[PDB]
Each structure stands twice: as structure tokens, then as C-alpha cells.
RNA sequence: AGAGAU
């Protein structure tokens, strides 16, 4: 309840800025901003960062795609460092 | 893996 930013790693570009956002905003409620840090050199190391409205949403995203084997790659969808511990 | 380039 204090974070909101997810980290997305290893995954075919099926997930792109708009699709990750569509998935995030509908499956997860509006992704405020999706950071595509890689993909500038080339489609290599496609990892991203996505921003969500509060966490129910972000926490939702990591739950939905983490551990997904897509095209032979296991997705590493994770949310920010948990600040809802205590 | 867990940091913002586009």
C-alpha cells in the first residue's frame, strides 16, 4: 500500500507498451506509466517497468503474469519492494 | 531481480 511500480523481465515482445498497459489497465486497472528502458539498442533485454494507480492493481499484475512460460521463456513479472509488511 | 531509457 506504499509502492505501485512493477518490474517486467524476460518475455517475448507480445507485451509492449500499449499491450502491457491494456493488460495492466483492464486486467489490472490503468498503468500510469510503462517504462521501456531497453529496446533502444534493439529488441534485446526487453525488460520494462510499469506504474500502476496504487497496488491492488500492481500486486494484481505480478500475480497474473509471473511464472509464465511464453515461447520458451519464463516471465519475471514482479512488483516493487513490499512496503505492506508492517 | 528489482531501475527510466524511449
Swiss-Prot record:
It is found in: Nucleus. Residues 4-82 form the RRM domain. Functions as a recycling factor of the spliceosome, a machinery that forms on each precursor-messenger RNA (pre-mRNA) and catalyzes the removal of introns. Chaperones the re-annealing of U4 and U6 snRNAs (small nuclear RNAs) released from previous rounds of splicing, an initial step in reforming the U4/U6-U5 tri-snRNP (small nuclear ribonucleoprotein) that can reassemble into another spliceosome complex; this step involves binding U6 and facilitating the unwinding of the U6 internal stem loop, followed by base-pairing of U6 to U4. Present with 672 molecules/cell in log phase SD medium. Monomer. Interacts with U6 snRNA SNR6 and the LSM2-8 complex (small nuclear RNA); to chaperone formation of the U4/U6-U5 tri-snRNP (small nuclear ribonucleoprotein) assembly, the protein is displaced from the U4/U6 snRNP once pairing is complete. This is U4/U6 snRNA-associated-splicing factor PRP24. It comes from Saccharomyces cerevisiae (strain ATCC 204508 / S288c) (Baker's yeast).
